[PDB]
Design a protein around this nucleic acid. Structure first.
Ligand SMILES: [Mg+2]
Ligand SMILES: [Mg+2]
Ligand SMILES: [Mg+2]
Ligand SMILES: [Mg+2]
Ligand SMILES: [Mg+2]
Ligand SMILES: [Mg+2]
Ligand SMILES: [Mg+2]
Ligand SMILES: [Mg+2]
Ligand SMILES: [Mg+2]
Ligand SMILES: [Mg+2]
Ligand SMILES: [Mg+2]
Lengths: 78, 88, 115, 90, 166, 48, 183
RNA sequence: GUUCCUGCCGAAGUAGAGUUAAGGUGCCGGAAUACACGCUCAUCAGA
RNA sequence: AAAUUGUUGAAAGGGAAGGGCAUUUGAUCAGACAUGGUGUCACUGGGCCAGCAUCAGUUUUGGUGGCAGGAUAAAUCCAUAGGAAUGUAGCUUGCCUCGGUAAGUAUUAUAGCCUGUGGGAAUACUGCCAGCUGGGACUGAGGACUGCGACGUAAGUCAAGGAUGCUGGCAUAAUGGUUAUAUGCCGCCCGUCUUGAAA
């Protein structure tokens, strides 16, 4: 039964098993807000982005060195 | 023969899958079981390792903790208990 | 023959502080309990329930209600210690305790001698 | 470095000089006098035949006095059925 | 717990124009001193009007058996309330020590009458110096000359689940 | 003042046990609660 | 202590024997029950009769199997495995007729049921409820008893031979020297 | 009639270790089919 | 348009389709150190894992040492006068299986015993120890230093405001997932109810 005692530790809260907090990204400008916080944060491309924009976002993310949580999504399946 | 251990039976869980109850042959009393504390347990091919923690009841049954819990289908399965780490 | 509880019936303490020591019954309190003294063995005089103690075939003359010094003298005169040592039961007890006492090196000597 | 040093002797049982962890070992009550063998030179860093021969001669010299000890060291140990370690005096 | 005998004396407090009141001595059987003191008080209110506040204990002392080697015959007087009415009882117990006799007494009383320690009240334990004053029969049974009888309930537990021999 | 300075003690249940099988009777009657005088020392040490 | 334990059914109570056997099976020990027709139950004949009826397999072995299955959690994997470990038989079929059979003291009727208290034999119950094989088993049992008497005579001869061999070993030195020295 | 989830205050919590009350130690089920007494097996035995 | 009915086609199965459980055999997928450096395959530093050592917290279990109290335990032991029966040693009487039998005094003798009562103590129990030493189990929380300390001639060191050190191995692996048959066991109309759960 859910209750507060089950609450997770703050230092480990909102953390993926890769250790990166997921941050939603829509465009290149929003990607660039995560320029140095590559260790703390990983980008996640939004569901409504078109395929043409996703390749640009992936290229810029690779250039910045920011981990993308969902690459090869809508460019590959699963 | 090359046996340097005693093959013992795994009875059940503590009732808790983490703790397992092990019945060791020729051990009628907790005092006899006190010797076996700290010894390495090995369920055998794949092997899972563990150790004897503390006694359980007056019949000489002991508690045991493995690195990964036993699959619960091994109740009554043969389990080995080595002499190392020796305290004698 | 019949194993009977009576004055002068020597007995063996199977469990207790003594952990096995011969004693002689001096007086019978009731059916379940009796008074025993083992002055040679070193057990203190005490009242004990018959459950802890098991009788032995040996017997000797003993006045009822005898004090510890008297029981010691009667024990010496009867020499029931030697008689017990003669018996096969005492030999078996000594046998089993010797079996536990042996060392691994001694056990290996046993194995070699058996071959 | 908390590694016990042991000899078979290799002459008796074919076990050479070696380092052994203490917890993985049982100690029996029977002893031999080690004064004959000097055992200073070899050390931890050394471990990173002739020395074993030198040690073995001295240790055999003491082994001879006690009866049947060479046979004991030669043979292995194992638990037979009905053997309960907790009573067993080692 | 295993019983202990206790001498208990209390003076019941001095007051103005009242000399040192007479010492009231008694022999309690209790596991420990505290229970002995409370038993003493509880007994005292029955004899005459007192209270713990109105009095004090003078001396609590443990009394050991003079001869715990000798087997003795003790006459024990017991009084209790089968709840509505209370009645006396005289038993004879063969035992080495007074305290062990009282222990056996309490066990037997609890077995036979469903009564607790609080309900039972001991008057006085008396050793019987000469035999043939033992009016009870079961005690008199064991005073016969050259008493002998075999061990009963000889059968013992097997201690093994399966026995090949029978 | 010194006693009030001390926080009320937090004690574990006794290691050996409570003694009598049933606690809820008074000490002479054969239960845990009540004035037990010096024997408190036996209890507290087991609890502490 | 053995790979397989053969338990005689005679003079035992169904509940206690079944409980002990079920406990052993759950620990992995393999047990086989034989001569279950002469198993015993406490109470009177009618009460056990109507109990088996308000259940209503007619054979005594099947009744014992039900009683034991009541212990084990058969619907689980573990319970099923314990159940294949078990074997039950009326009379001794081969090859267990050539193997000695232990007794469980905890379930013995002689040690458990008080004299002067009505009990019931499972064979009579099974026959009364419609098990029409109690007759054939009895003749096999009589033949088995004749063979067992012959085996007992052979065992007496073997014990005499063992006594002679023990005497022969006595007059050898090495054992005597070993015993005096140690063990 | 009930009233998205969680938390909080108040008449008359999560996980590891140990201890323990109430209870229990034939098996399902973890614990002595341990001991020691008195009883009772009744066609209402007695859980 | 749902809901519903009928013909045709594919598949499975059995009298229902049907599930859950176990075993069996297979098929198929994922499975780093891209280890930082040096040396002419060798050594060294980091990270993962396994073991050990030395610590810290929590408790569990032993062994063993010292000390105080009691009626300075009480017993016992050796003394010790008096007393008795569960009446020894004997004598006496009757009869006697020719050795045992029966009971009158008999108070210690070819047994012993109980009280008064002297000495010496020991042990038991209770209690204390800022007394030693052994085996277990769970926890390793914190991340420059600061404090109370301890010891060190001193310098410094430490078990002192939360774990560090040593040894070994460290991958086509360790293994993990998915899926399919065959074999048998159990269940098997639905609601409620029920225990902890089918029933
Ligand atoms: Mg979507
Ligand atoms: Mg406990
Ligand atoms: Mg908790
Ligand atoms: Mg078709
Ligand atoms: Mg520690
Ligand atoms: Mg503590
Ligand atoms: Mg002292
Ligand atoms: Mg003293
Ligand atoms: Mg005297
Ligand atoms: Mg004195
Ligand atoms: Mg410790």
């Amino acid at each position: 039964q859910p209750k507060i005692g089950y609450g997770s530790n703050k230092k480990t809260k909102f953390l993926s098993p890769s250790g990166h907090k997921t941050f939603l990204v829509a465009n290149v400008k929003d990607l660039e807000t995560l320029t140095m916080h590559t260790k703390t944060y990983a980008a996640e491309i939004a569901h409504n982005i078109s395929a043409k924009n996703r390749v640009v976002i992936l290229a810029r993310a690779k250039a910045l060195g920011i981990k993308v949580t969902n690459p090869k999504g809508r460019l590959a399946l699963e | 023969s090359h046996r340097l251990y005693v093959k013992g039976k795994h009875l059940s869980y503590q009732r808790n899958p983490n703790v397992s109850l092990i019945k060791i042959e020729g051990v009628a009393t907790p005092q006899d079981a006190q010797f076996y504390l700290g010894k390495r347990i090995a369920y055998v091919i794949r092997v899972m390792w563990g150790k004897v923690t503390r006694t359980h009841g007056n019949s000489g049954v002991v508690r045991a903790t493995f690195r990964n819990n036993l699959p619960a289908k091994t109740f009554g399965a043969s389990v080995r208990i080595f002499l190392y780490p020796s305290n004698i | 023959n019949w194993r009977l509880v009576e004055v002068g019936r020597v007995v063996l303490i199977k469990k207790g502080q003594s952990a096995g020591k011969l004693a002689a019954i001096v007086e019978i309190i009731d059916q379940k309990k009796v008074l025993i003294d083992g002055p040679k063995a070193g057990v203190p005089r005490q009242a004990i329930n018959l459950g802890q103690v098991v009788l032995t075939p040996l017997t000797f003359a003993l006045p009822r209600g005898a004090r510890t010094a008297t029981v010691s003298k009667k024990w010496a005169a009867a020499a029931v210690c030697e008689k017990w040592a003669a018996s096969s039961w005492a030999k078996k007890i000594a046998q089993r305790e010797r079996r536990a006492a042996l060392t691994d090196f001694e056990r290996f000597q046993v194995m070699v001698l058996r071959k | 470095d908390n590694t016990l040093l042991i000899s078979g002797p290799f002459k008796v049982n074919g076990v050479p000089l070696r380092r052994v962890n203490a917890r993985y070992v049982i100690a029996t009550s029977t002893k031999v006098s080690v004064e004959g063998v000097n055992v200073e030179k070899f050390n931890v860093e050394y471990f990173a035949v002739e020395d074993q021969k030198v040690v073995d001669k001295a240790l055999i010299a003491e082994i001879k006095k006690t009866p049947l000890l060479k046979q004991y060291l030669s043979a292995s140990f194992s638990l037979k059925n009905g053997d309960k370690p907790h009573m067993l005096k080692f | 717990a295993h019983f202990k005998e206790y001498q208990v004396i209390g003076r019941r407090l001095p007051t103005e124009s009242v000399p040192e009141p007479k010492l009231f001595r008694m022999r309690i059987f209790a596991s420990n001193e505290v229970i002995a003191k409370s038993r003493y008080w509880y007994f005292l209110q029955k004899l005459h009007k007192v209270k713990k506040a109105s009095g004090e204990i003078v001396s609590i002392n443990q009394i050991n058996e003079a001869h715990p080697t000798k087997v003795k015959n003790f006459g024990v007087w017991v009084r209790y309330d089968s709840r509505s009415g209370t009645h006396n009882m005289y038993k004879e117990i063969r035992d080495v020590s007074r305290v062990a006799a009282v222990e056996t007494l309490y066990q037997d009383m609890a077995a036979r009458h469903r009564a607790r320690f609080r309900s039972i009240h001991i008057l006085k334990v008396a050793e019987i110096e000469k035999t043939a004053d033992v009016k009870r029969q079961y005690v008199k049974q064991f005073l016969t000359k050259d008493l002998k009888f075999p061990l009963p309930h000889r059968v013992q537990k097997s201690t093994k689940t399966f026995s090949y021999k029978r | 003042q010194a006693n009030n300075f001390l926080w009320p003690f937090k004690l574990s249940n006794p290691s050996g046990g409570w003694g009598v099988p049933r606690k809820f009777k008074h000490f002479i009657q054969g239960g845990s609660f009540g004035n037990r005088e010096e024997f408190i020392n036996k209890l507290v040490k087991s609890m502490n | 202590v053995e790979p397989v334990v053969v338990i005689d059914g005679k003079g035992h109570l169904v509940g206690r024997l079944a409980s002990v056997v079920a406990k052993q099976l759950l620990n992995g020990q393999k047990i086989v029950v034989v001569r279950a027709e002469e198993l015993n139950i406490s109470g009177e004949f009618f009460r056990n009769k109507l109990k088996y009826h308000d259940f209503l397999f007619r054979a005594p072995s099947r009744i014992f199997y039900k009683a034991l299955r009541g212990m084990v959690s058969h619907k689980t994997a573990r319970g099923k495995a314990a159940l294949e470990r078990l074997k039950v038989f009326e009379g001794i079929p081969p090859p267990y007729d050539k193997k000695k059979r232990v007794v469980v003291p905890q379930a013995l009727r002689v040690l458990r049921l008080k004299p002067g208290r009505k009990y019931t034999t499972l064979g009579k119950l099974s026959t009364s409820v419609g098990w029409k094989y109690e007759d054939v088993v009895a003749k096999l049992e009589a033949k088995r008893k004749v063979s067992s008497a012959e085996y007992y005579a052979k065992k007496r001869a073997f014990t005499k031979k063992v006594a002679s061999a023990n005497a022969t070993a006595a007059e050898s030195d090495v054992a005597k020297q070993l015993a005096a020295l140690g063990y």
